[PDB]
């Protein structure tokens, strides 16, 4: 049993000083400074508690080197809108447009009759 020290000048257990234990080929144990755990993007509706699928969850400045297909999903409103609510917006916008046609037909008969 051997005890080990830090490798940097940060001797505080802050959120930017999170380490993991690993074994070297030199037959000793040393700390490895981990990166922060990224989070998947949220949906634009705000009514789905989960996070988007098919998109990598990593720190936001790591998104530059990732590919296009790794950052979104091949769909309309892809990579920023959950699949549950985007297809509900299709059937939300369509029924308004049909109802607006219904209202203006009943509005038109009012012009002709009175």
């Amino acid at each position: 049993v051997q005890r080990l020290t830090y490798r940097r000048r940060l001797s505080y257990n802050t959120a930017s000083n999170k380490t993991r234990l690993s074994r070297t080929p030199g037959n000793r144990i040393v700390y490895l400074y981990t990166k922060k755990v990224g989070k998947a993007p949220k949906s634009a509706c705000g009514v789905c508690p989960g996070r988007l699928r098919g998109v990598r969850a990593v720190r936001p400045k790591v998104l530059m080197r990732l590919s296009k297909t790794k950052k979104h999903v091949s769909r309309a409103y892809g990579g920023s809108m959950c699949a549950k609510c985007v297809r509900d917006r299709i059937k939300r916008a369509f029924l308004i447009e049909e109802q607006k046609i219904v209202v203006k037909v009943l509005k038109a008969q009012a012009q002709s009759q009175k």
Partner: protein, 94 residues
């Protein structure tokens, strides 16, 4: 009343409970009428009515809650959208 007329179907007629199962049910069109709850989402108010006017299906809006509509069918769970297959001996359809 409506609920007393509805419960006659329950032990005699054929019925389908649930939004998804009645969403496909209207698409064959052998159903005649649907009951909608008042508290169900406003998107799914018009969604059934647009399918119903394609299949010439009558729409009746229940005054009670979805929990009360579930108790009106004799079941112990709430129901949002239901459709009748064939009334046994009831005149819910006119």
């Amino acid at each position: 009343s409506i609920n007393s007329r509805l419960q006659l179907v329950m032990k005699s007629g054929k019925y389908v409970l649930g939004y998804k199962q009645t969403l496909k049910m209207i698409r064959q069109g052998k159903a005649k009428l649907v009951i909608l709850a008042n508290n169900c989402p406003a998107l799914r108010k018009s969604e059934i009515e647009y399918y119903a006017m394609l299949a010439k299906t009558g729409v009746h809006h229940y005054s009670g809650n979805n929990i009360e509509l579930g108790t009106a069918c004799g079941k112990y769970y709430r129901v949002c959208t239901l459709a009748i297959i064939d009334p046994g001996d009831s005149d819910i359809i006119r």
